[PDB]
Amino acid sequence: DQTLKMIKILSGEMAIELHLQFLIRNNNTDLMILKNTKDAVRNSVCHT
Amino acid sequence: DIPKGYMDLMPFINKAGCECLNESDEHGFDNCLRKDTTFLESDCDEQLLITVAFNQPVKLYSMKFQGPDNGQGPKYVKIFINLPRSMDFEEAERSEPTQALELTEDDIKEDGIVPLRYVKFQNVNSVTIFVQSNQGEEETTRISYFTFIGTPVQATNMNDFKRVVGKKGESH
Amino acid sequence: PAVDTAEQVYISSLALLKMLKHGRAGVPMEVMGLMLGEFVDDYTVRVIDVFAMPQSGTGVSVEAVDPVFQAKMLDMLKQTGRPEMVVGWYHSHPGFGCWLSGVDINTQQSFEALSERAVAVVVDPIQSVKGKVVIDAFRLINANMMVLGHEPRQTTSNLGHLNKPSIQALIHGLNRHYYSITINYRKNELEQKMLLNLHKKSWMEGLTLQDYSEHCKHNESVVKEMLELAKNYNKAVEEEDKMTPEQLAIKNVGKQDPKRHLEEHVDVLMTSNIVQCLAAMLDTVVFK
């Protein structure tokens, strides 16, 4: 019961799920910058 | 058996290089290299010195120094790599070995493969085995089977040079 | 597959010395020899020994590798304890820098036929005349992959772009037909404590009192020139022209009176005198 929930919380399941939810929901990246970087790479170094 | 991605070095053993010391005439070195009951014994004492040569530099991963369970099988094995000259029994004891092995009864068995420290054997050209004692303390020791498991290290055969591009007479 | 720009041709201390000596013997011509080492792994080519091949009218070409000479040399070196493989070849480019010509490229391809990693080394005994050692390691760039893929070397690391290509190598075909390999010098102690003996200075040199005659002459000359320099420093400081003094100190910069020919001489004089006096007292104490 309660001990199972505490065990789960310590193990890192709940925390990881909450962090993933926060990151995914508020994930808003300026993809135009990465598009510009893509059109500025002819050297495989700058590719990786 | 054998480990993944590795091959036995039987095809890579140069018969010219191999030479045994203290081997009995009745049972020679060639017997210990065959997967038969034929075995190699040492005529004058329990100490034996078996050296093998490799056509091209080979890598050493695991060696199977099998022997009879009667007690005359190898017990303490000393190994050296890339010996410029033949080994003397008095000098062999003095020198430090590349990997001193104390073969347990399990290793001597037909299915027993004794691991070797792969790091040390990277450019082995000729490995010499010094059986310093047998399990049963018998007068003579025997080696039922013996071969090395590893990989062939690509070696430049400058004896096979030959121009592949360009015309003769060129200079610079 | 692809060669990493992180590959490093390890050249041993003995190998570099032998290659330089062989190159300096041949000048005004071109010498060549096979390099003995190991292809320890994909990102490293280690050369331990280099043995010169006899000079021949052919020059540095596939026919300079006398098969009988090479075979007997390797066979006899195996007995001594050097069972190394042929990892590459080296040839001296007197005058011109480290690059590869057409015949050089053909010989390099012939070597590659045996092993895909047969590095080629070029050493110029004339350029390497001072603390600079102009030594380059070159291998052939499959002109096919020039279009099939793109460049020939993966850049998985930064261990290779810490070097710069040379206009010479670029003109003669660098990054086009040949690509350089970073040359790392494998030096160890014993081989570095033995080489600090070329000029090690005997204990006696550190107890010789020089000679007092030329010591006095040197002291007198330095003191007279320092008196002249002190006159000049007097003139410079007492002037102290304030017409933008920050600009004055920059419009009279010529390695002159103020401090350069100044206390430099003070240091010379004081070092010489202190060392001489300390040596004299150490001798007066040690020797009776």
Task: Please outline the helices and strands.
This is part of a larger assembly, with chains A (48 residues), B (172 residues) and C (288 residues).
Chain A: H1 2-11, H2 13-26, H3 31-38, H4 44-47
Chain B: E1 7-8, E2 13-21, H1 29-32, E3 40-41, E4 48-66, E5 74-81, H2 89-94, E6 101-102, H3 105-108, E7 114-115, E8 124-134, E9 142-143, E10 145-152
Antiparallel strand pairs in B: 1-10, 2-4, 3-9, 4-7, 4-8, 4-10, 5-6, 5-8
Chain C: E1 3-4, E2 8-12, H1 13-26, E3 32-41, E4 44-52, H2 67-80, E5 85-92, H3 102-114, E6 119-123, E7 135-140, H4 145-148, E8 153-154, H5 167-172, E9 178-186, H6 212-239, H7 245-251, H8 264-286
Helix pairs in contact in C: 6-8
Can you describe what's shown?
This is part of a larger assembly, with chains A (48 residues), B (172 residues) and C (288 residues). Chain A has 4 helices and no strands. Chain A is an all-alpha fold. Chain B has 172 residues and is mainly β. Chain B has 3 helices and 10 strands. In chain B, the strands form 2 sheets. In chain B, strands 1, 2, 4, 5, 6, 7, 8 and 10 form an 8-stranded antiparallel beta sheet that branches. In chain B, strands 3-9 form a two-stranded antiparallel sheet. Chain C has 288 residues and is an alpha/beta fold. In chain C, 38% of the residues lie in helices and 19% in strands. In chain C, strands 2-4-3-5-6-7-9 form a 7-stranded mixed beta barrel. In chain C, strands 1-8 form a two-stranded parallel sheet. In chain C, α3 links the parallel β5 and β6. Chain C is elongated and about 75 Å long. The relative contact order of chain C is 0.12. The interface between B and C is medium-sized, with 25 and 37 residues. Chain A: It comes from Homo sapiens (Human). Chain A: Belongs to the proteasome subunit S1 family. Chain A: This is 26S proteasome non-ATPase regulatory subunit 1. Chain B: This is Thioredoxin-like protein 1. Chain B: Its main location: cytoplasm. Chain B: Active thioredoxin with a redox potential of about -250 mV.
Provide key terms for this protein.
part of a larger assembly, 3 chains, B: mainly beta, two-stranded antiparallel sheet, 3 helices, 10 strands, 38% strand, C: 288 residues, alpha/beta, seven-stranded mixed beta barrel, 9 strands, Thioredoxin-like protein 1 (chain B), protein-disulfide reductase activity (chain B), cytoplasm (chain B), nucleus (chain B)
